[PDB]
């Protein structure tokens, strides 16, 4: 018995990450085993850690937590440093629009657990963590129970399946801070402190949890690992375009007919995501903008881009929030400003004051209460959140809003 | 002074024993305390700090930092309403209006009986089901006032 | 199927705002609209109750079957569950009796009401497999139902472990292919098994031995659509609707010579007179009512309009099908149409039914066309009285009934033909 | 020697996989065949029987039993005309006359081009909208000849 979850729609053309998670219920270990689950683990334990890293490298797998960093490369960096090492699954998923990771957690937890075990083996970590946001209580209980299931079947503990490899997975919960998805703040939180990002470099792979080499990977990234071992890197790389191969998850929301999570190859276009897969727009109204979570704003002239990590690609977490022709861009920008105001950790002065002022002033603009000085101030602050920032939040808190100012000047001009 | 009831103290001890180091259990402990009392009692932090082997100052700062924790208002049921972009677009205001109609309260307020508190929250990671709300750990899409009324009737 | 086949926009009107709350508007109501009205909350409540409790509630509600026989629904379920599983649940959407078009408007306009009722009912009797058997001539209803089932699957109301309850259900949609007899519950089962629609000797009843010989509940569309209301309101509040011995909504498909033909949701204390004159707007041209045909079952004269639309001995009963004939309508011509129906629908297993349904129509046609001998007249009388013997289903039992009533109630018109 | 085109075969296989037991799909398969060919070709029954793992005898009996299926006449559009009591009372004969005027055929007949067949049927369950007809899956109230002519113009 778990807390009530809304039944998010999920659809796949690849039948990999969403093979089970396309059905909105918990798939327990017996059902996972019937589908051939945990045989990739068994295969992996018969391979060298080095060989696993090599396959993951050659698969072209990239991080699903927003930056698209090559996973194998990350793991290679970690294992160049003396142990012990730690493995962390980032399940903080708190960016607006983004709900892809929870459906793996809540519906196919063993896919994630199997990937964690393989990944931990690959990097020589005997202690792994899942850090799940506090607002995912059902996912937390589901994972705790699935870990117990895995222990009882001998996939966790000491000397897993006679391999001599030991692993414990600990589940930690967040408590309301978006910034705890930033990998160094996550580590700080795991250490029992406030979620304050650390200056990088050093990257976690050099100095992470308790100062030791630590790999942080996103839920989606890790859920790919069992497929790479199962299929081999060649067949994996045959999925989608050769340079951005493999499945990707796309959480689509807002003004579409079929909001939900889509498992698609990365040669799919943004237009296809919206019209081919997500059923087109509510009321068949014209697309005005797509917000890539709280990161970017694409206009209706930019729909033909691929959902890959190329320079002209959509990139990120594949988060697609659709606004149509009647949606007020300034109102929407205010919501993005409010998010950053609520999430800056306050360590860096331009971020602390900038995220606050951006929202404060934009609220005045929206309500028709802004002076000429408020307008000029808003413009200045928007451009000056990033200086001295030590993490990506300060670097991007003004980015989406600036794009709206450039791409929808007429609507902003009306707020005069 | 304050002391935890034994059954709670047991649960806190389980969390503290769970991770390799005691201090890693701080957030699980605070969730447990909030679950038990309907808020974080100020007086609970000193004994918690002792069990975690942490300075009180450290614990106070953590409570302050993490938005899920509430030291001010006791409530049996927290109605967390998403006020972020997708829910706003798809009808947060209709949900809030429906809540005011049923419960007589607005965001930040607690009903006089201490039963319900409306807590505005950032994106709950269920945006396809906008507008989203939680009642304690349970999460729902808001469809209508009639639908909401029946959901809330399940919490006594 | 974003686009469905064309359907006539049958008029629908309700005084109770239950079964026709959405189906009074002639269009498909999809799951979002259904959820906005509080849909599927009854399912949620049901899954927190024991199956035993749901049966008890449906029993105490006084709900009766809307497929013609008015059998107490809760009692039917109790009979099924006293037999070992697995059990099956079947929604009868064969609706093919002349005059009868009540079930289709629920299917085509409010499919989730039916689906929700199927899920609750299936849970109540412990069935993990349910069927809807829809007549072949309702293609729109079929596509609408297939699509609505997928919607329900997407929202987690169907499949395994529905809403964490541990209850599994799949609903399969089967199509008929032109036989009225496949509405008879045992022929329906034969058809579901891939055979011809031949009724089985009863007993055993389906609740004992049905689909693949296992306990099976067959219930009519209308019956099932009541179930969400019983759970939502509770049995006591439901029983407060209409007369306490025949409580709750009933659907009345009214056709023929009325100004407002269509489907009416009304309580069962309504009289036949009220159905025609108060609700269906009176007669075309304000001509006098001559007769009402209760589908192809009964003929009521103008002296019988003050009866209640309930399942009492002096009530209208049946499926509430009201076909109005007025003063200029030839009763013999009408009787012939009824004979032709039974001629076309006997399955032929039973000899008096097979030959009697055929001869009744053959001879009545001769009578109508003025080509009947004295022997044909006497033969027609005899055959009409002798369709029933040895019959194993209701069709043979009733194929002569309406016509006999016209012979008794309208002798002067028949005499004109003789 | 007779074989189902791949696209038909695929649809048949889908129906056969839909129910728990293959033989339950027999009517859905026959509907599909009639949809594809405009009738049930006699030669189709043998391979269908093989797919359902049923004797040919069984399949032939089912086809014969169910009135919607037609083994004799190919037609692109079946105009199903209700000839039961309510439609008769409200104007079946006017509909049949209008059809004869427009198409030159009577019940049971097919136009010379193979395009339309008039099929007299029992009550279609739309009696309030009498007199009723279908054109393949589409169903309509007959109002008048001009109206019918417009409806039929949509089927090419
Ligand atoms: C937006 O999110 P962020 O986490 O700020 O994105 P980011 O672009 O700084 O890094 C994304 C991921 O790649 C890793 N990474 C990037 N460059 C690396 C390097 N040279 N050596 C080792 N690891 C490296 C980061 O630690 C993180 O796990
Ligand atoms: O019209 P028909 O289907 O011919 O009408 P009917 O009057 O024979 O029966 C109507 C419904 O009640 C059920 N039923 C009747 N008597 C029953 C009994 N003794 N035990 C269990 N179920 C019983 C039938 O199976 C059917 O579902
Ligand atoms: C403000 C901020 C929030 C982030 N939130 C998340 C998050 O919720 N989940 C996540 O996996 N990565 C998040 N990241 C990115 C992580 O720091 C990190 O790049 C990622 O977890 C690495 O795993 P990957 O390579 O598999 O993507 C966030 C980064 C920043 C700057
Ligand atoms: C010849 C014949 C045809 C029938 N046609 C139907 C029909 O189309 N729909 C229906 O639900 N019941 C029909 N019935 C009644 C069913 O056998 C059965 O009583 C009913 O489906 C049970 O459900 P209920 O108790 O909800 O009415 C028919 C019965 C006979 C004898
Ligand atoms: S950039 Fe902003 S969120 Fe990141 S460390 Fe600095 S103040 Fe905190
Ligand atoms: S009574 Fe008539 S319809 Fe019923 S089984 Fe016998 S022959 Fe068939
Ligand atoms: S914006 Fe409300 S759940 Fe994401
Ligand atoms: S009598 Fe023709 S549709 Fe019913
Ligand atoms: Cl191996
Ligand atoms: Cl201290
Ligand atoms: Cl005539
Ligand atoms: Cl054979
Ligand atoms: Na989920
Ligand atoms: Na968090
Ligand atoms: Na913060
Ligand atoms: Na019927
Ligand atoms: Na309809
Ligand atoms: Na089954
Ligand atoms: Na039928
Ligand atoms: Na029965």
Look up the CATH number of the domain holding residue C259: 3.10.20.600
User: Could you tell me if A167 and A126 are in contact, meaning their C-beta atoms sit under 8 angstroms apart?
Assistant: yes
- Is there a single domain that holds both residue B88 and residue B61? no
Subunit contact C334:D124, Cβ cutoff 8 A: no
Same domain, B131 and B86: yes
Closest CA relative to residue C266, chosen from C275, C258, C257: C275
CA atoms within a 13 Å half-sphere pointing along the CA-CB vector of A221: 30
Nearest to D68 by CA among C343, C94, C137, C95: C137
Q: Do C320 and C335 belong together in one domain?
A: no
- CB atoms under 10 Å from CB of C229, counted, come to 24
Q: Is there a single domain that holds both residue D67 and residue D80? A: no
The tokens describing A213, both together, are 């080499």
Mark which of B73, B97, B126 sits at the end of a domain: B73
Distance CA D93, CA A293 (A): 65
Residues C191 and C56 grouped into a single domain: yes
Which of chain C's residues have a Cβ under 8 Å away from the Cβ of B146?
A: 36-38
Kindly report the CA angle at D78 between D72 and D81, in degrees rounded to 5? 110
To which H or E segment does residue C308 belong? Answer: none
Tell which of B41, B57, B73 closes a domain.
Answer: B73
What is the Cα Rg of chain B in Å? 17
Question: What separation in angstroms does the CA of C238 have from each of C223, C231, C249, C264?
Answer: 14, 9, 9, 18
Q: In this structure, are A257 and A187 located in the same domain?
A: no
Note whether residue C123 is domain-resident: yes
Pairwise CA distance, residues D18 & A28, whole Å:
25
For residue A387, the 8-state DSSP code is T
Ligand 8 pocket member D126 (CB < 6 A): yes
Structure tokens at A152: 């009882």
Tokens standing for residue A370: 């802004």
Q: Are residues A319 and A381 in the same domain?
A: no
Distance between CA A289 and CA D31 in Å, rounded?
A: 46
Q: Provide DSSP, C242-266.
A: S-TTS-SEEEEEEEESBSS-EEEEE
* Same-domain check for residues C394 and C266: no
Residue that finishes a domain, picked among C326, C361, C387:
C326
Please state how this structure was obtained. X-ray
Q: Which domain holds residue B54?
A: 2-73
Quick one: B95 and B66 in the same domain?
A: no
- Strands of C235-337, DSSP E: 249-256, 262-267, 289-294, 298-301, 322-326
Has residue C72 been placed in a domain? yes
What sign does the dihedral C392-C393-C398-C400 (CA atoms) show?
negative
Q: Give the list of residues 6+ apart from residue A6 with CB closer than 8 angstroms, or none.
A: B126, B129, B132, B139, B140, B141
Q: Are residues C337 and C309 in the same domain?
A: no
Q: Structural domain tally of chain C?
A: 3
Ligand 5, atom nearest to A343 Cα: 3
Q: Which letter does DSSP use for residue C136 in this model? A: T
Give CA separation, D116 vs A99, A173, C285, D18, in Å.
53, 69, 36, 32
**Of the candidates C303, C234, C232, the residue with the CA atom closest to the CA atom of residue C272:** C303
**Secondary structure of residue A271 in the 3-state scheme:** helix
Nearest CA to ligand 4 atom 29: C184
In a domain, C289, yes or no: yes
d(CA C222, CA C250): 8
Q: Of A249, A262, A256, which Cα lies nearest the Cα of A290?
A: A256
Helix ranges (H only) for A157-311 are 183-190, 219-231, 233-237, 270-272
Q: Quote the DSSP letter at residue A87.
A: E
Q: A243 lies in a domain?
A: no
Residues having C-beta closer than 5 Å to ion ligand 19: C 94, 135, 176, 179, 182
Query: Could you give the CA distance from residue C153 to residue C385 in angstroms, rounded to a whole number?
Result: 51
DSSP D13-64: HHHHHHSSSGGGGHHHHHHHHHHHHSS--GGGHHHHHHHHT--HHHHHHHHH
Half-sphere exposure of residue C90: CA atoms within 13 angstroms, side-chain side: 33
Q: Are residues B151 and B78 in the same domain?
A: yes
Strand extents, DSSP E, C297-355 = 298-301, 322-326
The rounded distance, in Å, linking the Cα atoms of A233 and A235 is 6
Ramachandran region, residue A164 (left: φ > 0; alpha: ψ -120 to 50; beta: rest)? left
Domain CATH for A159: 3.40.50.11540
By the 10 Å C-beta count (0-12 exposed, 13-18 middle, 19+ buried), B153 is classed as exposed
Sheet holding B132-135, edge to edge: B116-121, B77-82, B132-135, B138-141
**B68 and B8 share one domain:** yes
Element (H, E) at A257: none
Whether A298 and A317 share a structural domain: yes
Helix (H, G, I), strand (E, B) or coil at A62: strand
Sheet containing strand A85-91, strands side by side: A168-173, A125-132, A85-91, A214-218
Domain-located, residue A212: yes
Residues D26 and D57 in one domain: yes
Cα–Cα dist A200/A186, whole Å: 14
Beta carbons of C101 and C86 less than 8 angstroms apart: no
Do A79 and A145 reside in the same domain of the chain? yes
Q: Which of residues 392-411 of C touch D (CB under 8 A)?
A: none
**Does residue C394's CB lie within 6 angstroms of at least one atom of ligand 2?**
yes
Same domain, D48 and D19: yes
Contact in structure between C81 and C126 (CB atoms under 8 Å): yes
Q: Give the CA angle between residues D119, D120, D124 to the nearest 5°.
A: 105
A158-192 burial, b for 16+ CB within 10 Å, e for fewer? eebeeeebebbbbbbbbbbbbbbbbbbbbbbbbeb
User: Which of residues A275, A298, A324 is at a domain's end?
Assistant: A324
Contacts of C370 (CB under 8 A, 6+ apart): C417
DSSP A200: S
Count of structural domains, chain B: 2
**CATH assignment of the domain containing C366:** 1.20.1440.230
**Is cis: bond before C265, omega within 30 of 0?**
no
The answer to whether residues C210 and C61 belong to one domain is yes
Distance B12 CA to ligand 13 centre (A): 28
CA distance A37 to A114: 8
Q: Do C105 and C37 share a domain, yes or no?
A: yes
Q: Are D43 and D107 members of one domain?
A: no
The DSSP result for C348-399, as a single string, is S-SHHHHHHHHHHHHHHHHHHTT---HHHHHHHHHHHTSSSTT--SHHHHHT
Residues spanned by the domain of C103: 12-239
Main-chain phi, psi angles of B140, to 5 degrees: -145, 150
DSSP state of B107: T
Do C313 and D57 meet the contact criterion of CB atoms below 8 Å apart? Answer: no
Same domain, B125 and B141: yes
What count of other Cβ atoms lies within 10 Å of the Cβ of residue A15?
11
* Nearest alpha-carbon partner for A54 in A201, A236, A212, A216: A236
Whether the Cβ atoms of residue A89 and residue A123 lie closer than 8 Å to each other: no
Residue C32 covered by a domain: yes
What b/e string do you get for C21-45 counting C-beta neighbours within 10 Å, with b at 16 or more?
bbbbeeebbebebbbebbbbbbbbb
For residue A146, tell me if it sits in a domain: yes
- Axis-axis angle for helices D26-37, D6-18 (nearest 10): 160
> CB of C130 within 8 A of CB of C90?
yes
Which residues 6+ apart lie within 8 Å of A41 measured at CB?
A114, A117, A118, A155, A161, A226, A229
Q: Whose CA is nearest to atom 4 of ligand 5?
A: A391
Residues A309 and A397 reside in one and the same domain: no
Place of tokens 């030590």: A390
CA B125 to chain centre: 16
Closest-CA residue of C relative to A9 is C154
With contact defined as beta carbons under 8 Å apart, do A334 and B89 qualify?
A: no
**Element spanning A50, H or E:** helix A49-59
The CA-atom distances, in angstroms, between B8 and each of B1, B25, B34, B39, B68 are 17, 15, 11, 14, 20
Could you say which of B73, B96, B111 is where a domain stops? Answer: B73
Question: Do A228 and A174 fall into the same domain?
Answer: yes
Nearest protein Cα to ligand 1, atom 25:
A203
**Interaxial angle between packed helices A49-59 and A109-123, expressed in degrees from 0 to 180 and rounded to the nearest 10:** 120
Task: Tell me, yes or no, whether B59 and B114 share the same domain.
Answer: no
Residue A284 domain-assigned (yes or no): yes
Number of Cβ atoms within 10 Å of the Cβ of C227: 28
CA distance A291 to A319: 8
Task: Clarify whether residues D15 and D53 are in a common domain.
Answer: yes
Give the H or E element holding residue C141: helix C139-154
| Residue D82 annotated as binding site | yes
**Edge-to-edge strand list for the sheet holding A287-292:** A10-12, A260-265, A247-254, A320-324, A287-292, A296-299
Does C72 contact ligand 2 (Cβ within 6 A)? no
Contacts of A406 (CB under 8 A, 6+ apart): none
Domain edge (last residue) among A265, A297, A324: A324
Select from C88, C79, C81, C91 the least CA-distant residue to C204. C79
């Amino acid at each position: 018995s778990y807390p009530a979850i809304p039944r998010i729609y999920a659809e796949t053309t690849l039948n990999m990450l969403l093979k089970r998670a396309k059905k909105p219920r918990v798939h327990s270990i017996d059902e996972y085993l019937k589908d051939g689950g945990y045989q990739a683990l068994e295969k992996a334990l018969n391979m060298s850690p080095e060989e696993i890293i090599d396959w993951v490298d050659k698969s072209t797998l990239r991080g699903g937590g927003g930056a698209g960093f090559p996973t194998g490369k990350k793991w290679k960096f970690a294992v160049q440093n003396p142990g012990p090492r730690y493995f962390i699954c980032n399940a903080d998923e708190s960016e607006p629009g983004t709900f892809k990771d929870r459906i793996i957690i809540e519906r196919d937890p063993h896919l994630l657990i199997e990937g964690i075990i393989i990944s931990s083996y690959a990097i020589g970590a005997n202690e792994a963590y899942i850090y799940i946001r506090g607002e995912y209580p059902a996912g937390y209980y589901i994972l705790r129970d699935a870990i117990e299931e895995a222990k009882k079947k001998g996939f966790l503990g000491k000397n897993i399946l006679g391999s001599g490899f030991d692993l414990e997975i600990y589940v930690a919960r967040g408590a309301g801070a978006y910034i705890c998805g930033e990998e160094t703040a996550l580590i700080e939180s795991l250490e029992g402190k406030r979620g304050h990002p650390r200056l990088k470099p050093p990257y976690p792979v050099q100095k992470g949890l308790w100062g030791k080499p630590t790999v942080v990977n996103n839920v989606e990234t890790i859920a790919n690992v069992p497929f790479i071992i199962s299929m081999g890197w060649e067949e994996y790389r045959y999925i989608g375009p050769s340079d951005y191969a493999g499945p990707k998850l796309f959480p689509v929301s807002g003004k579409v007919k079929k909001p939900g999570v889509y498992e698609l190859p990365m040669n799919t276009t943004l237009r296809e995501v919206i019209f081919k897969y997500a059923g087109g727009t509510l009321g068949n109204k014209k697309v005005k903008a797509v917000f890539s979570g709280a990161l970017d704003c694409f206009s209706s002239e930019e729909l033909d881009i691929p959902m890959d990590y190329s320079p002209l690609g959509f990139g990120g977490t594949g988060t697609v929030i659709v606004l149509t022709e009647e949606d007020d861009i300034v109102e929407a920008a205010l919501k993005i400003a409010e998010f950053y105001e609520h999430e800056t950790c306050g360590q860096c002065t331009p971020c602390r004051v900038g995220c606050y002022e951006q929202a404060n002033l934009l609220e005045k603009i929206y309500k028709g209460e802004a002076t000429e000085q408020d307008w000029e101030g808003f413009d200045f602050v928007n451009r000056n959140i990033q200086p001295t920032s030590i993490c990506g939040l300060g670097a991007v808190a003004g980015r989406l809003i600036r794009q709206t100012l450039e791409k929808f000047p007429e609507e902003w001009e009306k707020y005069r | 002074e304050f002391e935890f009831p034994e059954e709670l103290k047991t649960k806190l001890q389980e969390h503290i024993n769970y991770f390799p180091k005691k201090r890693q259990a701080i957030l699980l402990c605070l969730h447990e305390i909030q679950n038990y009392y309907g808020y974080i009692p100020p007086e609970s932090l000193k004994p918690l700090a002792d069990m975690l082997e942490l300075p009180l100052n450290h614990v106070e700062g953590v409570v302050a930092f993490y938005d899920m924790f509430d030291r001010e208002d006791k409530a049996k049921y927290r109605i967390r309403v998403c006020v972020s972009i997708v829910c706003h677009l798809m009808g947060t205001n209709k949900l809030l209006k429906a809540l005011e109609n049923i419960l007589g309260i607005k965001p930040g307020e607690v009903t006089p009986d201490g039963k319900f508190k409306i807590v505005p929250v950032q994106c709950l990671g269920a945006c396809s089901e906008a507008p989203v709300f939680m009642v304690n750990d349970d999460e729902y899409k808001f469809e209508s006032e009639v639908q909401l009324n029946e959901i809330l009737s399940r919490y006594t």
